Amino acid sequence: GDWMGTIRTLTGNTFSLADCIPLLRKTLKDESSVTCKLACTAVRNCVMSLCSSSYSELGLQLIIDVLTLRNSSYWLVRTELLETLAEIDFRLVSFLEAKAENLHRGAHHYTGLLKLQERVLNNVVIHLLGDEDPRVRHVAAASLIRLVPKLFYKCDQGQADPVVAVARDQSSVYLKLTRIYRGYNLLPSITDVTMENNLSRVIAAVSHELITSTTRALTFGCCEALCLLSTAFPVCIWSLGWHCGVPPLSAKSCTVGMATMILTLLSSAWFPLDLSAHQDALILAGNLLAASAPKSLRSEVWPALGDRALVPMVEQLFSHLLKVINICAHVLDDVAPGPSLGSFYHLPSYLKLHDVLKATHANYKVTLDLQNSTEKFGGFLRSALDVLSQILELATLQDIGKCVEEILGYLKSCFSREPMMATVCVQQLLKTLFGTNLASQFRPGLYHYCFMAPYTHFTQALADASLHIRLFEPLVIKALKQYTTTTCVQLQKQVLDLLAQLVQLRVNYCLLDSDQVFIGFVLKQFEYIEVGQFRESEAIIPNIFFFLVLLSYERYHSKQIIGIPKIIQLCDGIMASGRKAVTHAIPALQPIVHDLFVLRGKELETQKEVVVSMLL
Amino acid sequence: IVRRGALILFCDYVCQNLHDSEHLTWLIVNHIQDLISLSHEPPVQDFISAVHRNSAASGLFIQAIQSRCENLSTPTMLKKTLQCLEGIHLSQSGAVLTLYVDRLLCTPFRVLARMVDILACRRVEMLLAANLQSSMAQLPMEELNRIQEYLQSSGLAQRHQRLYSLLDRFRLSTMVSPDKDWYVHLVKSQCWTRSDSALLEGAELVNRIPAEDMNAFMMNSEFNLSLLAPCLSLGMSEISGGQKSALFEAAREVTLARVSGTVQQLPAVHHVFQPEAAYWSKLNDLFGDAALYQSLPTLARALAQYLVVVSKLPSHLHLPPEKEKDIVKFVVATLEALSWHLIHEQIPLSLDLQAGLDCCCLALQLPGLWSVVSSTEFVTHACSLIHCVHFILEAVAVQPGEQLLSNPKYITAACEMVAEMVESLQSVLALGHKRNSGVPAFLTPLLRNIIISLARLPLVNSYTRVPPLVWKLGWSPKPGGDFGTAFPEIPVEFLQEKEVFKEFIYRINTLGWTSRTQFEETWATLLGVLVRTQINVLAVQAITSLVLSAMTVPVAGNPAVSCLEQQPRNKPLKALDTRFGRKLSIIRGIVEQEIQAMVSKRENIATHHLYQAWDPVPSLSPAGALISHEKLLLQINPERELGSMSYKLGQVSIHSVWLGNSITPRKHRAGVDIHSCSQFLLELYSRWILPSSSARRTPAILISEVVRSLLVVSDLFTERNQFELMYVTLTELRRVHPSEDEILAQYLVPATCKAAAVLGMDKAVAEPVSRLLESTLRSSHLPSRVGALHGILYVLECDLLDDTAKQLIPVISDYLLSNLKGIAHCVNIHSQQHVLVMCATAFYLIENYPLDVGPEFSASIIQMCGVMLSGSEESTPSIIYHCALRGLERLLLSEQLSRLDAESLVKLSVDRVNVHSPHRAMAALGLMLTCMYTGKVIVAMERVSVLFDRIRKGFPCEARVVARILPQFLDDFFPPQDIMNKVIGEFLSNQQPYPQFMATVVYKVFQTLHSTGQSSMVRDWVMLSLSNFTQRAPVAMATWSLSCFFVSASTSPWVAAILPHVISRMGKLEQVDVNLFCLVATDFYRHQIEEELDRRAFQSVLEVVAAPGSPYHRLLTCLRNV
Amino acid sequence: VAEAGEQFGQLGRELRAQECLPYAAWCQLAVARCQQALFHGPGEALALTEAARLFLRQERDARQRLVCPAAYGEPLQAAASALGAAVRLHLELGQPAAAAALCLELAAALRDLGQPAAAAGHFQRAAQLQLPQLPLAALQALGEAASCQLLARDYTGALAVFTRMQRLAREHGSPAALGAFSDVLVRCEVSRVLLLLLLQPPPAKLLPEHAQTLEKYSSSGQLPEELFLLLQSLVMATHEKDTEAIKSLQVEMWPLLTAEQNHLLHLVLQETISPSGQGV
Ligand SMILES: Cn1ncc2ccc(CNc3ccccc3[C@H]3CC3(F)F)cc21
């Protein structure tokens, strides 16, 4: 009103902001889907700023009128709606609903409540996971992950009312004061109970639609939504959000969520033949089983698992993975599906899966697009190798000792198609064989949020401030070859990590690189890295320096391979260039500093002094 | 966030600066609501604690709350207010006590009113504990009088008795013989006061007023209108017992007088109510009056209770023609009042929505009231009904931003609203559908039936029959009639579109037909389509449904009133036409009427009302009115789930086809000639399914749908030649058609058996049909086996040849014994239609073929049904439980069972009454009563002890019913002396949850002793029991139990009449309770005793408990001068 | 031989494109017989489920789309037979989640078609197959079974099911409860109080769990405070005999209750003013 009074005295214009909203409310009801799409885009630009203003009744009314568009015949109106509803903060909308007295009644004098969050979440976002268009299902799944942080429910232990809920968000930003595989978390997570409550309600609603689904589209959309949720809110961190009671404890907490639904889908006659929904189910099944870890691990088959109720689920997933990887190996080698744990010829549902995969790869063999990430045979193979790599953290030499010769056979077929994930799978087999895997190495209110907790943390901080091994050789030899003939820096990182792991397992480097060709080639990359000609060098530098630093300890091969004086002259050779310090020089120093100061003399003191002269 | 946070911080500051009274004063005086709202924030709790530690601050805090008590009255704000006031300073106790008594104690939230009471008690107890010179300075006498005079004048003193006694203790520290005119005075003390407590007892009291006085008693301004529906229901129980009810005719005249008197207050011209002038001012003055608005639902509740019975009354009790217009005006004004209340003053009471919609539903069903509202004079009334029903539906069912589906202009709006509502019956008004989940289940049946009736009005009917897709296809005829809305019937060129035709079929099936003209028009339209295979199939399904709709009973073609005719295969039971059978029909009829209330599907009952069940079975003779539900006791087919009214195979029995049409080995219904329809279809279908050699082969789908159509429309056949041509056609079809078609066989097999059974099952028909049945029982496809069992049930109605029975009955008996034994322990995992039709076939064989079916069969079937009935709620579904148990009751009551079979049913019936579930126990009680009366000792004393246990262990519903039947069971199986000790013991026992039910059992037992001349025996048992009555532990329950006992013992008609008054005052010990107790005990002493040794005995028992001022000491004081 | 199974598959797809649902379903049953002879149990359970869906579609067209009075229900019998066979297959394949899903599909069709008493038995069968491996899915199945028993007017059967749900939700969801189980607990608590006020059991039928609930209302926890004050007020008004309190509470409670709970509160007020079992 103060801004509008200023422009009205300067211009003489009688116009008012309340005169616009009727024109959006009109154009949302247009006969043309393109007008309707553009009107939905216009609501996306302003709805949250309206809810944040003295016109917040009009912002609430736009959210009511836009929900009509869920029934539109045009998919772009459905995706614009999903993207619009994902902008909304339901803590703020719950505050606006609680002050409404006329808007609950609307036209026709309704006698209940608006219930906008329940209508958005259930009647739009979870409903459009059942859409026949996979583009709509994908945007519905992505919109749901944006909503979980912003939902509000009554009787929450962290926020009793929506005004306390909005004050938490506003305060949390401005008053802010071997390596295990991707799905494992052994430390006790400290979690927001309000987020874990919201996540519990969302997962319960999506798993209800999954188990009750009568259409292939809705089953597939629910799997996509649960797979992306398990990525954004990891099952091992958020275990009480994922928990359905299945392991009868905390019913530092652990879970398998709804893994029995997902493994029943993976053994069905129909569900495995959609490659996208199948690969989402593999990733979700891997994540659900890995989130059991420190509670399911001990203190015979799968002897590491003391929780014998999960052993059938692990054997089922592991045997499914070996069969589907063996199918890919047959398709890539062009071998017909006919004449041990990966055997599939006697199983008609796996013969149908083979013919889908063969047809998918036949289209790949006759086309030349090399930027497309959405290619379904490669995505499927990559997902199966990733989940096998994840399940190998729970394995022991007694579990893989009959399988390892078989799996390395499949990896030799798969290496040309997915070399990076085949290399990860080799590393997890080596961890399992040498015994270095996980299985072997084992009342709040406004005063609280707006002042008292921030001031308590600040004052306490000021107070403290005053105080089988021969089977692996041809795959390591393929990896060493391909590093010298590739421009994929993501593969090159992974081969340096494999070589670092072989050096840490005390494998002799003179067996891997007798003629010094690999160190010679790795050193010859620094010419191109320094002059700015090696593309994506920012990805490879820290792995090269970690590897050369391990090679500095191997003095016993009659002579030292490189030595810290050369690594330091490589490091300042990068640092002297015009290339940015944060992507280049700093990532080269981090391996050197932890080695020279944390891990590890008349030479060594001078090297520490030289490195401090570089840090300055 | 800033508004709340800045108060919290300023409270945290003032708690460190308590010398600075200016900031404390400004917080209290300007932010009291925000302090009370935020009282859970730690600094605000500390601030309120500092205000409690200060005399002047506590005074400001109290005076501030007084200035905001029009707010601070939402439940959570009132709770928070009392939580602040609890700790307040000792020197302010008179001021806060005043705030409690003259503002906060008046509140309607019951849990919060006890918090105000408890806190007020604590503050007056502090004022009694403090030194009196301070306490009378806190409470002047000119305030201490106000609070007590207000507590008396507001009626709070009789609810908050402790508080008034503490104010009394504080002020004291500072300063007759019973007759008609007595009886009418007792009843007006209960019936001339506005309340909704004890309405069933209140009706029973008005029923004993002399018939000459009842009209004057119910016409007085003081009479509680809430008694009109109870009186009409109680009086209908007398009419349906064959008596004249003086109470029903009084209540009828008063309901119609009050309905007419309410219409005489409306404006003399009517305008359509629209949710979006002087007339609207008059309506705001009428509907805004709290007296008039309360009168509308209460009179509507009485009107609905009259209208729901009216077609079953004597002809002089039917609607007066002169009051039909006023009833339509009243029913319209009630929905307008409910709609006006929803706009201005939130949702009505659920009982008040229900009463308005009940009247509207019932008035549209009656043909007299229908003839008024469908007239041109009533167009604005018809539009108002439509606007109000649409408005109430959206106000309940549709959230803001949703919509229901996803001429004067009020006429066009009415058309569109009824068409929108007729589509909503698929979804929003479909009971148990996902779209119905926002409608509460008491509204769904009412709204469905109201919408089907409104869609039949001449104003909107032809519009509503047009498919919405045809208006979108740009069709645009000019309408023309008395209302300007008569559209022509849809052109046959539109019905060539599949989805337009599906939309048309839905509307003709949902609405039915309003006259024979509309039937003949829709017949012509569907033959115009019938003359693409999918359109032909839909046309065969539509014409089948049209012809079957003529078979609907009390008014043909009207789905809002009527359901399909049933002609059950089972006969009247001759065992009921006997001395013990007639007494069984009464007691079993009480139990059956309650099983219907509990378990019936209620498909033909739209309105809420128990005790309204009816079956669509006409009185049948060679060519009537419906046979009453009390005359069909065990006649309805065993395979039909209770209260389901949908079509089934076996709908019409072979004996009914033979009797009604005279074709032993009705042609016009609602003026439709079903003979010319069914003859045309039989001829058309006979050409299509047996095509000539030059014609293209008929599609298999069309053959199956035509043979299904024959199976259905053959219920309308009227001549032997029709069943003969049906039989010949289906026989030749079975010869040429490939025998592996199990999709055809499921219709062809029932249809062939039905035609063979009507033709009389002679040797040339019977051998082919037997060979068809034996092979169909071996099918892979379960619906075709269920079809064979319905075919078997059709042929069992015939006088079969011995040589076909010797062949057929063994195969049927083997199939039943092989299939029932494998499933009886786990019925829930098997097809319920297969189990129900098997049990019906077995029960028909045991009753009608007991010499051809072996003696092992009857024993084996009873053993397997016992295994089903002994299964848990999960293992045996309720539908199989009730249908098997009514089949076993028929078996026993038919007298074809052996004495050993009957003894096995006795053992079954007694075990099955001992279950948690009240409806399963109530049915098992029906079987046990059937066993005992057909059985006409220590055994009967066990059986009566089961009934007494069901009263003690039972829910109030089952216990009340068991207590209604128990008096007749006692009189039928015992000399009174054998059970008299149990009857009085079970009334007295401290383990009795229901003394109020047992009071009527004692009353009925003592009244049968007076009527049978045993008046010498009631004095023996009163004098014997009196000691045990004085030992009842609470003196209120002891005095009350003796009041019931002496009322039960009295020969005096007016003392015997007051039992409902005594029952309605259970556990009270007011002066009126002691006064009545003394009078009813005096009546027993003056009239039932005469012997001076018994007068001495009576006084000697009272002396053991006659402590001073007790009701016993009052009674001895009253007796000792007689 | 499998070639007959693909030919029956093609015939089924073509007959479905012609809307010939009973013969399309019959072709899927012929595929199931081919899968049985090949010992491909997963393919047999698939073929039987697709046969059942075509029969359920035929029943929905007859009783929902067209509302034919001549629909006595023969395709529902065919559907339930094929679902029962596929459930029996999934249980011997060791797949109780797939068996439960087909029970829920039949229960949903029976509820939609106006058979809630039959739907409640199939909802309870689904719950029992789920319970040892999917507790929260089993609670979702019991919630539907309770909803069906209220539509069937089996109020004591609903009181038993909500009592089982609240015990299971405390046992698997825990004194605070996780988000999804807490929503189950609030539904059970409010519905059980209204059912205990409707049914009014004698001291022989007050279980420890029922008495323990009615003591709490004679501290709101998972319930919102305004509803908890209104429920405490309703328990007091019905333990008194205050019809004008129950009337005024029913209007304040209407916005806070579900439609199923507003029906229960209507039944409490109706049973208070006009009791059942008197024959008048
Ligand atoms: C959607 N759709 N399309 C085909 C089809 C067949 C069966 C089922 C039943 N459901 C099911 C069948 C087999 C395996 C798993 C499950 C899921 C419950 C679950 F485990 F999540 C659904 C189907």
Residue numbers in the entry:
A (entry chain A): 790 to 966, 983 to 1056, 1062 to 1109, 1126 to 1165, 1228 to 1330, 1353 to 1377, 1423 to 1555, 1563 to 1578
B (entry chain A): 1895 to 2069, 2095 to 2195, 2201 to 2330, 2354 to 2478, 2497 to 2588, 2591 to 2632, 2662 to 2932, 2953 to 3138
C (entry chain B): 43 to 216, 256 to 299, 310 to 371
What wording appears in the published article?
Consistent with our biophysical data and the presumed specificity for the HTT-HAP40 complex, the ΔHDX-MS was localized to a single binding site at the interface of the N-terminal domain of HTT and HAP40, with decreased deuterium uptake spanning residues 1016-1028 and 1073-1085 in HTT and 82-87, 89-93, 122-127, and 133-143 in HAP40. Based on density fit analysis through Coot, the (R)-enantiomer fit the map features in the binding pocket more closely, with a density correlation score of 0.64, compared with the much lower score of 0.48 for the (S)-enantiomer. The binding free energy difference was 1.5 ± 0.1 kcal/mol, with the (R)-enantiomer as the eutomer and the (S)-enantiomer as the distomer. W1080 showed the largest difference of 1.5 kcal/mol and was one of two residues which interacted with the ligand >50% of the simulation time (**[Fig fig4]**). W1080 was predicted to form π-π interactions with the phenyl (edge-to-face) and the indazole group (face-to-face) in both stereoisomers. Inspection of the cryo-EM structure suggests that the methyl group might clash with H132 on HAP40 (**[Fig fig4]**). The halogenation may strengthen π-stacking with W1080 and/or introduce favourable interactions with nearby hydrophobic residues such as L88 on HAP40 (**[Fig fig4]**).
Huntington’s disease (HD) is caused by a CAG repeat expansion mutation, giving rise to a polyglutamine expansion in the huntingtin (HTT). Here, we report the discovery of a small molecule ligand for the full-length HTT protein in complex with its partner, HAP40. The ligand binds HTT-HAP40 *in vitro* with single-digit micromolar affinity and one-to-one stoichiometry at a druggable interface previously predicted computationally. *In silico* studies predicted and experimental analyses confirmed the (R)-enantiomer as the eutomer and initial structure activity relationship was established experimentally.
